[PDB]
Design a binder for this molecule. Structure first.
Ligand SMILES: *[C@@H]1O[C@H](CO)[C@@H](O[C@@H]2O[C@H](CO)[C@@H](O)[C@H](O)[C@H]2NC(C)=O)[C@H](O)[C@H]1NC(C)=O
Ligand SMILES: Cn1cnc2nc(N)[nH]c(=O)c21
Length: 246
């Protein structure tokens, strides 16, 4: 299991937690030097448990699917909360079984559905470590509308940071001050799948992408990624969703 305590957290400890998270994910092979995530895994070994502690010491345990890094649900004291979707439901059979009651949230865990329930797109929700602290706080006591917002912050300050060096860096800059995400961040978040597929399709194609991937950069200018020599591939992305899942 991996743990992170917001109390006494600085950019450095966060970096270590995200490194720990990355190393918690299994993989047998690397593609162009980046860990390729497993196609599938059997039983309880498919889920990673994250223990998160807010500033006051309260905690929630989050269950993450190790083949994609998707959050499936979490535990607050004695109530387990799971997304309203098949995979999440499958996940309820191996984790948080000793919970007194299990609640199914009224939405599945994809950005589109979470942004609807939250009432705002993630362009306008501030993220950072202070926000993570709030997120944890908000999940300790049920409120489907509040949880949507908190989960959008949680998914990004953990899963998305794990997948992209850039996003981990964005969060370290927001260690004592929240700030809405840059469009580069949103763009990356949205391309993890495409990039993952294209970096794999370049393996028997001299490192050249079958189809170019379009992102928005630091400045907000539209850019095209056609090949693995790009910074995004050489230095940004840290995990690859196996094509068997796309
Ligand atoms: C692969 O991507 C690189 C960019 O990392 C392309 O780079 C060209 O050369 C410089 C720096 O590498 C770029 O800024 C230029 O805009 C590019 N000029 C060209 C040749 O178009 C490189 O071209 C790409 N190579 C491919 C497509 O195999
Ligand atoms: C990032 N992401 C996209 N779809 C997702 N679905 C779930 N359930 N959890 C996630 O973290 C997620």
């Amino acid at each position: 299991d991996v743990s992170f305590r917001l109390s006494g957290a600085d950019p450095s400890s966060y970096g270590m937690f995200i490194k720990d998270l990355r190393n918690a994910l299994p993989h047998t092979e690397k593609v162009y030097n980046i860990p390729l995530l497993l196609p599938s895994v059997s039983g309880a070994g498919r889920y990673l448990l994250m223990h998160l502690f807010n500033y006051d010491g309260n905690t929630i345990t989050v269950a993450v699917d190790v083949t994609n890094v998707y959050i499936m649900g979490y535990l607050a004291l004695t109530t387990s909360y799971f997304f309203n979707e098949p995979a999440a439901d499958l996940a309820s059979q191996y984790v948080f079984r000793s919970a007194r009651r299990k609640i199914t949230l009224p939405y599945s865990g994809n950005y589109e559905r979470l942004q609807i329930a939250a009432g705002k797109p993630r362009e306008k929700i501030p993220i950072g470590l202070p926000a993570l602290d709030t997120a944890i706080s908000t999940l300790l006591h049920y409120d489907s509308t509040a949880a949507a917002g908190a989960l959008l912050v949680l998914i990004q300050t953990t899963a998305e940071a794990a997948r992209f060096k850039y996003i981990e860096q964005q969060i370290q800059e927001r260690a004592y001050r929240d700030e809405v995400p840059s469009s580069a961040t949103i763009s990356l978040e949205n391309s993890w799948s495409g990039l993952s597929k294209q970096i794999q399709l370049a393996q028997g194609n001299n490192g050249v992408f079958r189809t170019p991937t379009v992102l928005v950069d630091s400045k907000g200018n539209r850019v095209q990624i056609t090949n693995v020599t790009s910074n995004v591939v050489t230095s940004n992305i840290q995990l690859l969703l196996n094509t068997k899942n796309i």
